[PDB]
Amino acid sequence: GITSYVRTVLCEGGVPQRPVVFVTRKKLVNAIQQKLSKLKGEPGWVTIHGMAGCGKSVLAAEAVRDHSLLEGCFPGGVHWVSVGKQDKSGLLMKLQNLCTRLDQDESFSQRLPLNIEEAKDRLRILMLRKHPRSLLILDDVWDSWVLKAFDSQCQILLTTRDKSVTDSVMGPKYVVPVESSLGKEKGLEILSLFVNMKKADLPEQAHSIIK
Amino acid sequence: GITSYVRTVLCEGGVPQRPVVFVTRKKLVNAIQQKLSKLKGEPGWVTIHGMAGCGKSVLAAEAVRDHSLLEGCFPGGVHWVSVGKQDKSGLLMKLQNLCTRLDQDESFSQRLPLNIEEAKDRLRILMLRKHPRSLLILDDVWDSWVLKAFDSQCQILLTTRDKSVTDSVMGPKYVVPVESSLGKEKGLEILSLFVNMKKADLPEQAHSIIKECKGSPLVVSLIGALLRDFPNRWEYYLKQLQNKQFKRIRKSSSYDYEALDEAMSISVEMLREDIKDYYTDLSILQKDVKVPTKVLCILWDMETEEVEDILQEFVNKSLLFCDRNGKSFRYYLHDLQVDFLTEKNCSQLQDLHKKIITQFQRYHQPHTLSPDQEDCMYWYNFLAYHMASAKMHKELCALMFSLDWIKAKTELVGPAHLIHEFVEYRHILDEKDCAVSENFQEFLSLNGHLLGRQPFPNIVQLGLCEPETSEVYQQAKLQAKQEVDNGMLYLEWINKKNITNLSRLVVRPHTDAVYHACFSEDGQRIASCGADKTLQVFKAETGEKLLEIKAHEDEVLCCAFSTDDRFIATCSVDKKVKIWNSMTGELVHTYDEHSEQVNCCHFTNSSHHLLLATGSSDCFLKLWDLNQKECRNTMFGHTNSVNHCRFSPDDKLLASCSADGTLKLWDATSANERKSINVKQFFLNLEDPQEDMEVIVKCCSWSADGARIMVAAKNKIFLFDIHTSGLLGEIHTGHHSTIQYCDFSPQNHLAVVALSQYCVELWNTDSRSKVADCRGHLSWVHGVMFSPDGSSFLTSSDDQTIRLWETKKVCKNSAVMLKQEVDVVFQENEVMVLAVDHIRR
Ligand SMILES: Nc1ncnc2c1ncn2[C@H]1C[C@H](O)[C@@H](COP(=O)(O)OP(=O)(O)OP(=O)(O)O)O1
Ligand SMILES: Nc1ncnc2c1ncn2[C@H]1C[C@H](O)[C@@H](COP(=O)(O)OP(=O)(O)OP(=O)(O)O)O1
Ligand SMILES: [Mg+2]
Ligand SMILES: [Mg+2]
């Protein structure tokens, strides 16, 4: 049960809304969230990983989707960044864009840094004062210097495919590892939603394809 | 009713004001609006789509045009963006421009983002705080990354042509799909506004052009504006659209294209090169055929699971409408879509027409065709069609000529489609063959009457009956010779040239006895009922089913077309005067008043007045006012049950007949009696105890001007002059008895009269002499009536048979057809048959 307020914080954050055809993974979401709860304060990084298409992002979106962990724990808003895969130049822009996003007031200089580190300063300072209890989520990430760039000393959680990526970084690191499996009961649940029929009404063919 | 405030919000939004010449589409607007209402909160996208120029934008503008949905629902203002079609650079500018538009305060940085995403941030943030309950509308949109850019998590509704576009996006999506149709009532509404006249005041020409329009409001506005300049050249554009070329129609307009052809060209380009070639093949398909997927598989030569998907991509491109009928899918086009194709693909089409056939040859042969296969009927119905375009006449001989192909085609198609094909066939091949086609059509004349039933009698045996030789007879003798050695005990016939005066055509509409039939006023088609009480409506020429009617309560008593053939009254024992539409076939008018079963029904001959005179067994006439549910005037007058009823050419008058025999020229305008000739003119001083004979007139024949009433009864035809209330003509019938049926012919003063026992003699009125005998109906006729041209006449009969006849044939003498009962004595090598002379011994 999403609170109306949760959506309001989430909209500001910019996390994608969950696909209309989804199926909770209560145990997994619960684990990330309880673990996610763990770094109550002081920096910290969380890595989530799986072979391609394991529900890795949706869980990240889903975990924060809940009110309890987020509201009591996280007075700071949540900011989502879609890192992707980047050459050094490309990475630079994302940083400026995060700069513009975070500084809604514009009190900070309209001029944007031409240097990565300076952006790192704007992030750290902004996280430190402007958004004291903020959590940053990342999407993908394929090389370490990238997290080197985002290494603001403020909690950022990166979700990915390589688990090697967060080795440059410093501070407590925890990993929740998503095996690509799912549940036969659940997929039937998912298939039903996809074709809109009582699960039993589903044809004999359906059972086998899920295998 | 626009609120003043609504306009104030709308102006800020920047949506265009609706064109001055518009016509609400209440149902559609209502649907979008109610649906549009649905995403009360939380992101959401709405897609609206149609083939080009379907009113897609105007609806978007119109939906929001209303106060109720917008004001309560949408505290945020509405912002409209005209996306168009864009390269990556072009798209970028629109974003900045939306940035500048939304931030009127300028509190946000004057500097503009050089990066799309940053603009996405400015939009999301601005939508989130600056305009909390805002709705964004988009125009067009041709590629997904575009909506990827606008995907702000805040409701945006995109209106377009492709429905594929909103697949990248996330969140609830609903689509309202606008078919390009419009309403005939509405377009007349639109046309009136375009030319500024009361709708009725609009010229006769106007109705027909709208049929061409096919509801693409773009065409209507396009024609309509075009007319504003030149009110005089009204027909011209009518024939122009009859031409089927849209290069002629052009107007500068708010809309973004000179012409309708102009819009389609824009749609075609986008398709990826591999797809693009395929569409053209799609060009060949009929304007109005839902083809089974398979045939598309055959032309393509590409496997079925694959073939469907490309078509699915088209349907999204809105260039080919879907048909989810069961597992089967029939795709088809708008008349406009088809026309564009020939306009833009015509040179290829003749060439391709030969491509499809060869592929079919690489698969099923026409004899190798089967009943179970889904595609085959298309193959019957239209394969014939492709070969014609192919222009290959020898191949056309390889197919259509084949008698067995005719057999299978007549097995599930019926014997009408082939006749229709043949008319097309005649131009395509050769004049000399045309004779062969003439011989085959002659072979068909014998086919219609009994051929369809079931026990498809071995035609090969019933075929050897034609005369002369031609190509149809030559085929038969050889086939017979082939059959004969094997067996089959075929019996040769040696007298054909000595026997049978063939009728031009025969129809069995019903297994159940016919009760009435009538020509279309246009003469293009005929409707017959029957004992079953179903009525079947048909076009006589090609002789192919053109109408099926499910039932009429009670047994049909008689039926008739409206003067403009727009209606069909149906009399019945129930007393349900069911005036079904003659086109849609759906019921329109209905009436009842008679104390007894109706004797006759007829629409007013006048184009103006709409009345329904109806005789019945209760003797009372009922002069219905067709414009009113209840009768204009009950008319007691006949002392006996009405025999027949017809409107007089003077609609003010209304003649009627009955068993008393006296004519009754009623004054319908006064709803009162005016004239009524007595009929004792059949004087006959017999030894019969009854005094002067009580004449019983049947048919209520009219003069070609209708100024006088021809009639017939007992032993004499009469020609009364109702305007002077006195006798004039008097055509005595053959010998003496009592007439069972009669029919005056306005041409040649002819009188086709069935006296008794199907004695359907051809007499000549006024001259008072017979022209020629007409043997050939079984069951003693049940009825006959001439074509409106008068060049032909139907012959309904008790057998359940309707024989068409040329006017010319009847006049010529034909002393043949031996007498029914004869004794024949056989003395060896020659057999002699006893006969009764056509005249005497
Ligand atoms: N309830 C659900 N949970 C997880 N995935 C779902 C659910 N319902 C549907 N899906 C499908 C649809 C989405 O395309 C996909 C979710 O994407 P996601 O798990 O974020 O992949 P990913 O982002 O880890 O891939 P990549 O490693 O390429 O980034 O799973
Ligand atoms: N009441 C009406 N409703 C719809 N269209 C109308 C009406 N009155 C006139 N028209 C004509 C004039 C306009 O040129 C046209 C409306 O344009 P519209 O339906 O927005 O096309 P469109 O924007 O969907 O085309 P495209 O697909 O090229 O964008 O229809
Ligand atoms: Mg991801
Ligand atoms: Mg438009």
Author numbering:
A (entry chain C): 105 to 315
B (entry chain A): 105 to 945
Sentences from the paper on this structure:
The apoptotic protease-activating factor 1 (Apaf-1) controls the onset of many known forms of intrinsic apoptosis in mammals. Apaf-1 exists in normal cells as an autoinhibited monomer. Upon binding to cytochrome c and dATP, Apaf-1 oligomerizes into a heptameric complex known as the apoptosome, which recruits and activates cell-killing caspases. Apaf-1 contains a caspase recruitment domain (CARD) at the N terminus, a nucleotide-binding domain (NBD), a helical domain (HD1), a winged helix domain (WHD), a second helical domain (HD2), and 15 WD40 repeats at the C-terminal half.
Assembly of an intact apoptosome was completed through incubation of the purified Apaf-1 protein with an excess amount of horse CytC and 1 mM dATP. The overall architecture of the Apaf-1 apoptosome is similar to that reported previously, comprising a central hub and seven spokes. The central hub consists of seven copies each of the NBD, HD1, and WHD. The 15 WD40 repeats in each spoke constitute two β propellers named WD1 and WD2, which are connected to the central hub through the HD2 domain. CytC is sandwiched by the front faces of the two β propellers. Specifically, the NBDs and WHDs of one protomer stack closely against the NBD and HD1, respectively, of an adjacent protomer. Compared with that in the autoinhibited Apaf-1, the WD1 propeller in the activated Apaf-1 is rotated by ∼60° toward WD2, which is apparently caused by CytC binding. Second, the conserved Sensor I residue Arg265 among the AAA+ proteins is H-bonded to Asp439 in the autoinhibited Apaf-1 but directly coordinates dATP by donating a H bond to the γ-phosphate group.
